Amino acid sequence: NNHSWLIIQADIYFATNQYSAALHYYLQAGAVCSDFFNKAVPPDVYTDQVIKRMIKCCSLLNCHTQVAILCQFLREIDYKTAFKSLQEQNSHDAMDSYYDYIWDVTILEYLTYLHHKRGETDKRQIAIKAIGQTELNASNPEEVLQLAAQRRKKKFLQAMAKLYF
Amino acid sequence: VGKKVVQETGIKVRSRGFQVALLNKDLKPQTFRNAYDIPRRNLLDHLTRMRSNLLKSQVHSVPIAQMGNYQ
Amino acid sequence: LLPLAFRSCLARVHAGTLQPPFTARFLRNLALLVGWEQQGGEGPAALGAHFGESASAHLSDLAPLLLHPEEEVAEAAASLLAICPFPSEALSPSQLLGLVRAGVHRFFASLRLHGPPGVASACQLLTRLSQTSPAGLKAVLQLLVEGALHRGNTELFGGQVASLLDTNRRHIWSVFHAGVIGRGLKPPKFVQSRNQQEVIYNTQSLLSLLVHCCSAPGGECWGAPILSPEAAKAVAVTLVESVCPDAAGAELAWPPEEHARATVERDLRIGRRFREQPLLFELLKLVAAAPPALCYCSVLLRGLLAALLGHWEASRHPDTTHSPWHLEASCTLVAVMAEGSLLPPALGNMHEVFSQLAPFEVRLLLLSVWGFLREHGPLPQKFIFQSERGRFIRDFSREGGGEGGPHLAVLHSVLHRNIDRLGLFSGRFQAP
Amino acid sequence: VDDWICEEEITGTDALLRRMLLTNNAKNHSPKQLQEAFSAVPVNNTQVMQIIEHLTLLSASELIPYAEVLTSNMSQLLNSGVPRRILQTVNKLWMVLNTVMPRRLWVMTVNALQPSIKFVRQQKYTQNDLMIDPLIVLRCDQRVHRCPPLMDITLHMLNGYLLASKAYLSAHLKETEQTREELKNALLAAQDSAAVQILLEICLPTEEEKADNLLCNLREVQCLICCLLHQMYIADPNIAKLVHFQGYPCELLPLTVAGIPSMHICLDFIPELIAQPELEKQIFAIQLLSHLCIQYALPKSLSVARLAVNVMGTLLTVLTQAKRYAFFMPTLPSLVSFCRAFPPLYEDIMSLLIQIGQVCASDVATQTRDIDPIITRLQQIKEKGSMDPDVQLCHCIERTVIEIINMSVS
C-alpha cells in the first residue's frame, strides 16, 4: 500500500512496454491514495505525467474510449490525442458503454460528429442523449460541474479497477 | 444552394470496398411492386391484400403541413 | 514444506487435476489446521507449523475458489478464508478488491442458496476485510449494498421483478384488419411469488452484516457499540449513487419548495426506486442510526419527499388509507428524519397522525418538514462531536427556534381541525 | 412431369397382375361396398384394406367410379391407429386417379381434408377458389402435417395449384386489360414464397413433438417438403433468394441445407444478404452461410466466409450495447462451423473472438453484475438463466471458444 512504490513499479513496467501491468499498478497507486477512488486522487500522485503515461498505456492496448475518458483528467484537457484516439475503429473496449463517463461536452460533440460521419446512427443517438443532460450543461454553476466530473471520475476509475485488478 | 447532391448510406466494411447499407426513410417502398420489401411477419396478410388489389377490387401518410389544408 | 505443499496443491486445483471432491477435502482440512492453530494450546505451540502464516501467502489463489461452481468447494474456501489470517503487513489493493468482490458474491450466492443459515462464513470474511482499512471498509460497504440493490439479488430482499402456419389457418378472402399495431398482443406481464418471512430474514442477515461492518470492534452490561459515521456515510453516499446519480441538485442545502417542480422527473425516479426495492428504507434507517451520516443522503430524502408531496397534492381520496404504500412511505420518511435528528422530536412525531388525516393536511405537514429543513438545514457541521460517549449530537435549541415555531403552529392547527379523532395524539407534540 | 412420368412402364408387372388377379369376379368390390366398409363404426380396417388392395389392379379409367368414396372417406384415415398400408395404398390410388381426372380430384380432395370444425366445414371450395388462392391447400387438417402419405397428396395439390394460379392470373390479367405486369409478378413471387414459408413451418417440431428425430413421421414429412422445395428452387431460383431474404427460423437451417441440394446457389447471394441494413437479415446470412460452409467447402464458400467474418468484426464497432448482444448471441455459434469448414480462418476467427471477448469484458466491468465473469478468469470447462446480457455474451464467447478448441482437437 505504498503509492510511491506502486508508481515506481508501474513506471518500471511502462518502460519495458508491459502496458496492462503498468495500468494495473497505476490504478493500484490511485486506489491506495483515494480509498478505492471514493475520494479525489491527490494531484501529487496522479500528476499529468502519470496520467499521460496512463493515456499511453490505454492507447497501446486499443482501448480508445478509455483514452478519451482519461484525457479529461489532465489539468489542461488534451483534445488532440482524445480526438485522434476516438477516430480509431479497432477498439478493444466497451466503446458506447463508456460514453456515460465523459463529462466534457467537447469530447461528446466530437463523438457525435464522428458517429454521424461514419454512419452509426444509434451510437450517435447515445452521444446526443449524453450531451442532452441537465448536469452536463457547460453553462451550469461551477460546483455542479465539478460534482458531475467527480462522480464520473469515481465511477470510471472504479470500473477500470474492476477491469484491471 | 438547392443541394442536388446527396449523401451515401454505406459503412465500408474493413478487413480486420464492400459495405452494409443504412436504413433510409422515405425511400418509397414498392411493396405492391416488389415482394422483397415484404416482412416475413406481415407476409400472408399483405399477400391477401395485394391479391385482392390485383383483382377487380403507405396511403394516408401525408406530411403534417399539408394535412389540415381546407382551402 | 508448508509453502511448497500449499503451492503445489493450489496449482493442481487451478489445473484440471485434483478433482473437486478432493479440492473440497483439501480446503476443509486446511481450514481445520488453520483453526486448530488459532485454537491456541500446547499442540500449535509445539508444532510451530505456521498454517496461518503460510496460507496467508496464497489468499489471492483462494479467492477464485470461493466462486467455484461446485458448492462444496465454494463453502470450504469460504470457511477457510473466514478464519485464515491476512498477510503479516496488509493486503494489496488488487488483492483486497478481489477478496471483497469474491466475498460479496459468495455472500449473495449462499444467501440465495441456503438462506441465513449458510451465510456466516462469508459474513465473517467480509467483516474482517472491513476491519483491515478504511479503504477495505468502504469497498465492502459499497460492493455489499450495490450487489444488494442489483437487478439480481434484489428478489432476496423483496425487490420487484408456428407464425405463418397458424396465421394461414385462421384465414376471409380479405385481410379485414389494415395492420397489426406493434408485435401483436402484449405479454401477460410479470409474476411474483416469494415468501415474506424469507425476505424479512434475508434482509436481517444483510443488515446484521452491515451493522457488524459499520460498528467499531466489540464495561456497561447493557448498551450498544457506536456505529461509525464514516461507515454509515459510505453507505449513504453509495445509496445516493445507486438510487439517483446526483449533481442536478445535490448540495446539502434544501432548495425552495417551488424548486421541487423543476426536478419532478428525478423525484419520480427516486420514488419508484423506493417503491420497487423495499430495503432502501432499511438501509436508510441504517444510515440514520449514525446521526451525521443521514445529512449526506439528503438528496434522496428531498426527492422522496417531493414525490410524496406530489402524490398527496394529486390525491382525490378523502383518507390516506387508500394510498397504503404512500402512507407508509410518508410515515417512514418522517420517522427516518426524526431518527437521524434532521427534525426535532416535536416535528418528528407527526407520522402518528398521517393514517388519520386526509391528503391535504399530510401534504401541509410534509411541506412544514420541507420548510423546517430549509430554515435549519441538514448539514453535518451542526452535529457537534460530544466526546462524553464518542458520537455526534444535534441540539436544535442552540440553532434558534429549535422547536420549529411556525411548523409546530401548522401542526397544532391540523390537530385542532381534527380534534374529534386526534385527541389522544395531542400529547405527542408538546413544545416543552 | 411427375404426374406424367408415373405413366411410364417399369416392366409391365402390373399388366401381368391385372391379367391374372382380376378374373375371379373381383369387380364385385363396388364403390358403395367400399363406402359401407369405411362407414362401419368398428372401422374394420381389414375390409377396407382388402377392397383397396384389389383396387390397385384396376386401370386408371375404371378407378374413376371409386374416386369419391376414397376421397371423401380419407379424412377418416387421418385418425390414429390407421395402418400405414392403407395410407400408402390410398396414396397409390390417388396418384393413379391424378393421371386421368386431376382437376376434379384435387378440388374434391381439398374438401376432404378440411379440419371439420363445422358440420360441413365449408365443403364448397371449387377450382376457382383454389386457383385464386392456393394456400387453402395448406389450410387443411392439422393431422396431415404428420401423415406422410396425406402430406404427399397435399404437396401434389399445392404444387399443382401454385402452377394453376400462375396461369390463372395471367389469363385474368389478359381478360381485364383488354404497371399490372409488375403487380402480377410480385403476387406470384409472394404467393410462392408464402407457400414455401408455410411448408417450412410445417417442418418445425411443435411443442407436442418436444415431449429420435430420424425415425419419426416428422422426418418423413420433412423429406417430402424438402423434395418439393428442391423442385421449386430448381424451377425458379429467385424464389429461393426471396425466401432466404425473408428468412425463416434458424432451427430449420440444418434441415433445409442438408435436404435441399439446390441451396448452394445461396452462396451467390449471401454477400447481398449481408449488405442488408436489417440486423436479422445479417444474422440469418451468417447462420445460413455457416451451414452452407459446413456443407459445401468451396473456394467461393471460403471467400464468403472471409467476408462474413470481416463484416461481423466490422459491425462489432458499429453496434451499441443491446445490438451487440442481439447480433452476437446467434452469430457466435456460426464461428465453430466456419472453423470446422475452413482451418485457414483460425487466425481471423480467434482475433475476432478475442476482440469481442475484450469488448464484452470491458462492458462487464462498467456495471455491477450478479455473476462477474472477470473474477471467474480461472474456472474450468462447463461442458453442456436470468443473467444479464453482458455476462451471457461473455459466457457465449467462452462457449464458442471451447467448441472451437474441442473441434480442432477432435
Next chain:
Amino acid sequence: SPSYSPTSPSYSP
C-alpha cells in the same frame, strides 16, 4: 446452376 452440385463433373461443349 441450381440443378447441379458445385462438385459435379463439369460439362465441356
Next chain:
Amino acid sequence: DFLLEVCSRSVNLEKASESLKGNMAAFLKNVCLGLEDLQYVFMISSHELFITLLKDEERKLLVDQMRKRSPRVNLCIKPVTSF
C-alpha cells in the same frame, strides 16, 4: 434472557395461530444464527419456549449447525513411531 422473557410472555403459546408460532420460531432461529458465542445459542436452545415451538429434528439440525460453525479439533503432534 430478558428477550426470552418478553418472547415467552408475548407468544400466547398453544392459543395463538400457527402463523404466529411459525414467525416466533423463525425469529428465535435467526437470533440464534446471529450469535457468536456458543453458550448463548445453547441457553436459547435450552429454553422451554424454543423446544416447544419447533420440532425435534430441526432443532437438532440447528444446534449441530451452530456447533459445526466453530468446530473444535485436536490433532496428534508427536511424530509417528512404530517402536
Next chain:
Amino acid sequence: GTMSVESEQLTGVPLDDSAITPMCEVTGGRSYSVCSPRMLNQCLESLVQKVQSGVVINFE
C-alpha cells in the same frame, strides 16, 4: 441546465467573453451573453431594434 435565476438578470444584457466577441466587435456589431429566457427576449428585441440600413465607419 438547472434553474439558477436571480436579480442579476434584471440588469442589462452583458457581453460575452468567447471567440465570437472580438470578430463581432470589429464588424460593428456585438455579442449577447444570454443566460435566461427573459433576457433572450430582451436580446431579440434589441436585435430587432438594431436591424437598420446604413454603413459602418471606423471613427478615429
Next chain:
Amino acid sequence: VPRIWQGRDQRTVLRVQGPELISLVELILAEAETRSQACSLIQARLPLLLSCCCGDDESVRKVTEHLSGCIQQWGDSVLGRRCRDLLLQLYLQRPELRVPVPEVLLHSEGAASSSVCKLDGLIHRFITLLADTSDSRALENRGADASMACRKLAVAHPLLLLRHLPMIAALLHGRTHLNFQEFRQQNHLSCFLHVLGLLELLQPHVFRSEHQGALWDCLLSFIRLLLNYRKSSRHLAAFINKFVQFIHKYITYNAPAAISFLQKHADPLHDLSFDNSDLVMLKSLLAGLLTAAEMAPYMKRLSRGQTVEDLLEVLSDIDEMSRRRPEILSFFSTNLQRLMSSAEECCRNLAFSLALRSMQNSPSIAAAFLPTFMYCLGSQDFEVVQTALRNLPEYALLCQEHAAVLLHRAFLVGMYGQMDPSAQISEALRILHMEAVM
C-alpha cells in the same frame, strides 16, 4: 428406410441408451459366434454400432469398458477373441478415446491385416510432410514440430503408427544413395535422426511380424546408408550411438529377428567391420552375440539458490550439459517447475527452455508440467503470463490431451487480461487441428 432419406444427395444417426447399446454389441457377438462355426461379418455390423453411437464419447467409452469386461470374463474364448476383434476395430474407427492400450490388444494379431482406420490419412500426411525438409528455415521449424508431434503420437497411440511402418521404410529408401555433401546441405540426416527417435519410442510394439518385415527393410536402408559413408562415418558418432542403442534394444526384446537380419546380411556387416577399423561397437556386437551421483551438487545449488547469480550460473551449467546430454533434464524437472514460475526474467526463460527441451525429449512427462504451466498462465505477474504464452504452442503440442484446457485458459487470460494470445492460440490450434481432424 428410403422414406427417411428421400431427397438427400448421397454425397458426404440413431439415439440409443447405455443398456440398449450393450444388448446391441452382445447381439453382434452372437452374430459373430453363429457365423464362426470370419471378421467380415463383424466388420459388416460395425457401421450399425457406429450409427447408434452417433460419435458420442460416453457411448464409445461405455462400449469399450464393457468389451474389456467381456474379454476378461470370457478369458480367451472364441467369443473373447471376437470381443478383441471388434474392440480393436472400434479403437481404429474412434481413436479419439485416449484410453491407454491394454496388453490384450497388443497381443492381438489382426490389427495389421486389412482394416479401416480414421486417422491413418492424417499420420500419412504427417510423415510425408516431415519428409520434405527443404531449405526454408520456417519450414525447418515446421518439420521439427512435425517430428516431435509424431514422437508424442507414437508414445500415446502407437498402433496407428505401426500400420505406417512401410511408410517410413519407403521414405528412407529414397534418400539413402545421395552423396554426403548434398546430404548435409539439403538437410536429410535430420529426418533420419527424427525417424530413429520415433522408432526408439515405438518399441516394444514395433516387434511383431509385419512390423518385423518393415523393420528389416528399414534396417537394410540404414546399413546401406552406413556403408554409403564409410569414408565419412566419423561425424555421426552420436547417430551411430543411437543406432547401437536401437540394436541393443532389438536384441533384448526380439533376439531371433535381429539374429536373422544380421546373419542374412552378414557380408555387408563384416565388410563395414573390416573397412572401418574405428567401429569398435560393430565388432564387439558381432562377436558377442550420470544418475543422481553426478547431478547431485547441481540440484543442490539449484535448490539452495537464492541470488539470481547462483540460479543463472547453475541453470547455464545444466543447459550446457543438456546440450551435450539431453537425458539429464528429467532429474531437474521438479526444481525448474518451480524456477519457471520465478519472477526473474532471464532465469524463468531459461527454466522454460530447459523444461520444454526436457519434455520434448520425453513426451510422457509433459503432463506433469501442466499444473505449473497454467499456474504460470494464471499468475498475477504479467511477465510470467507473457513468457508462458510465448511457450504455449510448443507445450500444447507436447500435451494434446490437455491442450483443450490449456488453450481455453490462454484465451481466458487473453480476454479478461489485456494481452492478445490470438497468434499463439491460433498457431497451436492450427497444429493440433492438423493433428486431430485434418
